[PDB]
Design an enzyme around this catalytic site. Sequence first.
Site, PDB file in Angstrom:
ATOM      1  CE1 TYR A  83      -4.005  -2.105   0.583  1.00  0.00           C
ATOM      2  CE2 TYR A  83      -2.647  -3.231   2.220  1.00  0.00           C
ATOM      3  CZ  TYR A  83      -3.788  -3.179   1.437  1.00  0.00           C
ATOM      4  OH  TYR A  83      -4.699  -4.211   1.505  1.00  0.00           O
ATOM      5  CG  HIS A 129      -2.547  -1.746  -4.074  1.00  0.00           C
ATOM      6  ND1 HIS A 129      -2.462  -2.355  -2.841  1.00  0.00           N
ATOM      7  CD2 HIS A 129      -3.783  -2.030  -4.550  1.00  0.00           C
ATOM      8  CE1 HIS A 129      -3.593  -2.985  -2.584  1.00  0.00           C
ATOM      9  NE2 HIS A 129      -4.412  -2.804  -3.603  1.00  0.00           N
ATOM     10  CD  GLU A 181      -7.153  -1.003  -2.628  1.00  0.00           C
ATOM     11  OE1 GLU A 181      -7.342  -1.461  -1.484  1.00  0.00           O
ATOM     12  OE2 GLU A 181      -7.599  -1.537  -3.665  1.00  0.00           O
ATOM     13  NE  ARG A 190      -7.907  -2.221   1.674  1.00  0.00           N
ATOM     14  CZ  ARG A 190      -7.977  -3.009   2.744  1.00  0.00           C
ATOM     15  NH1 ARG A 190      -8.217  -2.501   3.947  1.00  0.00           N
ATOM     16  NH2 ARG A 190      -7.893  -4.320   2.597  1.00  0.00           N
ATOM     17  CG  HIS A 214     -12.782  -5.923   1.698  1.00  0.00           C
ATOM     18  ND1 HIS A 214     -12.972  -6.154   0.355  1.00  0.00           N
ATOM     19  CD2 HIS A 214     -11.454  -5.699   1.855  1.00  0.00           C
ATOM     20  CE1 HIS A 214     -11.814  -6.082  -0.273  1.00  0.00           C
ATOM     21  NE2 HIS A 214     -10.877  -5.807   0.612  1.00  0.00           N
ATOM     22  CG  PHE A 229     -13.883  -2.653  -1.944  1.00  0.00           C
ATOM     23  CD1 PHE A 229     -13.522  -2.496  -0.613  1.00  0.00           C
ATOM     24  CD2 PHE A 229     -12.899  -2.979  -2.872  1.00  0.00           C
ATOM     25  CE1 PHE A 229     -12.205  -2.656  -0.208  1.00  0.00           C
ATOM     26  CE2 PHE A 229     -11.580  -3.140  -2.479  1.00  0.00           C
ATOM     27  CZ  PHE A 229     -11.232  -2.976  -1.139  1.00  0.00           C
TER      28      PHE A 229
HETATM   29  N1  LIG Z   1     -12.740  -5.718  -5.201  1.00  0.00           N
HETATM   30  C1  LIG Z   1     -11.701  -5.033  -5.681  1.00  0.00           C
HETATM   31  N2  LIG Z   1     -10.464  -5.349  -5.284  1.00  0.00           N
HETATM   32  C2  LIG Z   1      -9.523  -4.594  -5.890  1.00  0.00           C
HETATM   33  C3  LIG Z   1      -9.711  -3.595  -6.815  1.00  0.00           C
HETATM   34  N3  LIG Z   1      -8.505  -3.038  -7.217  1.00  0.00           N
HETATM   35  C4  LIG Z   1      -7.630  -3.712  -6.530  1.00  0.00           C
HETATM   36  N4  LIG Z   1      -8.162  -4.678  -5.706  1.00  0.00           N
HETATM   37  C5  LIG Z   1      -7.389  -5.685  -4.952  1.00  0.00           C
HETATM   38  O1  LIG Z   1      -7.492  -6.859  -5.772  1.00  0.00           O
HETATM   39  C6  LIG Z   1      -7.304  -8.040  -4.997  1.00  0.00           C
HETATM   40  C7  LIG Z   1      -8.479  -8.975  -5.186  1.00  0.00           C
HETATM   41  O2  LIG Z   1      -9.697  -8.325  -4.871  1.00  0.00           O
HETATM   42  C8  LIG Z   1      -7.173  -7.481  -3.593  1.00  0.00           C
HETATM   43  O3  LIG Z   1      -5.737  -7.412  -3.413  1.00  0.00           O
HETATM   44  C9  LIG Z   1      -7.853  -6.078  -3.567  1.00  0.00           C
HETATM   45  O4  LIG Z   1      -7.172  -5.194  -2.671  1.00  0.00           O
HETATM   46  P1  LIG Z   1      -7.263  -4.912  -1.077  1.00  0.00           P
HETATM   47  O5  LIG Z   1      -7.760  -6.113  -0.373  1.00  0.00           O
HETATM   48  O6  LIG Z   1      -5.864  -4.553  -0.790  1.00  0.00           O
HETATM   49  O7  LIG Z   1      -8.211  -3.803  -1.020  1.00  0.00           O
HETATM   50  C10 LIG Z   1     -11.018  -3.272  -7.217  1.00  0.00           C
HETATM   51  O8  LIG Z   1     -11.308  -2.401  -8.016  1.00  0.00           O
HETATM   52  N5  LIG Z   1     -11.979  -4.042  -6.599  1.00  0.00           N
END
Ligand SMILES: Nc1nc2c(ncn2[C@@H]2O[C@H](CO)[C@@H](O)[C@H]2OP(=O)(O)O)c(=O)[nH]1
Length: 104
Positions: free
Chosen positions: A38, A40, A58, A77, A92, A100
């Site tokens: 992070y 990222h 995020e 986030r 989440h 999300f």
């Molecule tokens: N659901 C979701 N996850 C994302 C997105 N972009 C990046 N991620 C990341 O993609 C992976 C699978 O969902 C996770 O590492 C999630 O991150 P975080 O858990 O760090 O938020 C997005 O647009 N939606």
Amino acid sequence: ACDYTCGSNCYSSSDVSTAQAAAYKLHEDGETVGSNSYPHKYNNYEGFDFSVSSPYYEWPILSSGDVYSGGSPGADRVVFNENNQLAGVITHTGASGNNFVECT
Ligand SMILES: Nc1nc2c(ncn2[C@@H]2O[C@H](CO)[C@@H](O)[C@H]2OP(=O)(O)O)c(=O)[nH]1
Ligand SMILES: [Ca+2]
């Protein structure tokens, strides 16, 4: 009252600004924190209608009040862009799997 409510977690604008400020600094320096690296990019697979332009990044915002420094990121986030503009606050919590939903 909360400015942002993510499940049971309650955040104020100051909580968000502090978290975002730390994340943007790391972004500008090209440095990361934690095993998930992070901050990222946030791909916005959910298709949220953000007021500010892409690309998005995020960073975890914690209910403890501390700024993220590694370890479990929790479910919440802060999403910001290239111009350090707040896109929104997501979680989440209440979303299936690794998806999300916005904090209310
Ligand atoms: N659901 C979701 N996850 C994302 C997105 N972009 C990046 N991620 C990341 O993609 C992976 C699978 O969902 C996770 O590492 C999630 O991150 P975080 O858990 O760090 O938020 C997005 O647009 N939606
Ligand atoms: Ca707080």
